[PDB]
Design a protein around this ligand. Sequence first.
Ligand SMILES: [Mg+2]
Length: 306
Amino acid sequence: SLIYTITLNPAIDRLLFIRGELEKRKTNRVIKTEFDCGGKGLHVSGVLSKFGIKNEALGIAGSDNLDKLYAILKEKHINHDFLVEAGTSTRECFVVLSDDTNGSTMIPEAGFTVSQTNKDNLLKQIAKKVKKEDMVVIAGSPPPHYTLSDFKELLRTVKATGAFLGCDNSGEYLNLAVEMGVDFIKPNEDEVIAILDEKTNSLEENIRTLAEKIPYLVVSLGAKGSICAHNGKLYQVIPPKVQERNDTGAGDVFVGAFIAGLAMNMPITETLKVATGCSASKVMQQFDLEAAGKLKNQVSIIQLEE
Ligand SMILES: [Mg+2]
């Protein structure tokens, strides 16, 4: 079996290193510029590759700066079969950071217009490639003009293959994934409440209720870690304390590692520890697989009763 990631709105992350903090209405001279692949789906492929788990990245990229994107991807050991949109360039996401601080400022470009031809080619790729024993992870918001309706088609096309389907989306797109009946999502507290539009039951009760539709539900609780519902049981994951260097792409590393865990047929509890371990290891970073291995064995998991 193989894992497929779907990045509907990939990007080329241009990291701009400055001195000190980013002061607005001032000149912030760039000390150095680094490049990285953008798009949640691609980040997931990156983590899975680091784990040595075979995967293939799918999505739509612009023709005009394709060589640049492809060069970065190889460098990150990411196998792909991207669709190419003629007459456009993949969007750039400017990430302002500094060796002197612990945060990052994001100024992402919107994304281009995907032709119906390419939306259709994506659906066809899924039908031709995805088998019942595979896993498909759609992560990241769609580009402009890729509608909720287009998303429905994408989700149903994956479902029709019988494969495991995980979604790391937001807003209306996340709500749609829940209505469509996916196998995995990683919403936060607020999103769980918004999906159910339930304001009077405990959060734990909201989670057990949503778990009736999502087999692998992981709700992030910011710094307190998270709560996971699976096979009728609820787990409270408490991450170890780490000094937080940059808490940005921690969510993508979690998903990548969580999926990795399942791919390696690890028990749910072990999977949660690995996922949380990698994420914490990423937090303390502007994600050492060795450090993640150690942090994993520092994560505590409490089942919660009833
Ligand atoms: Mg049930």
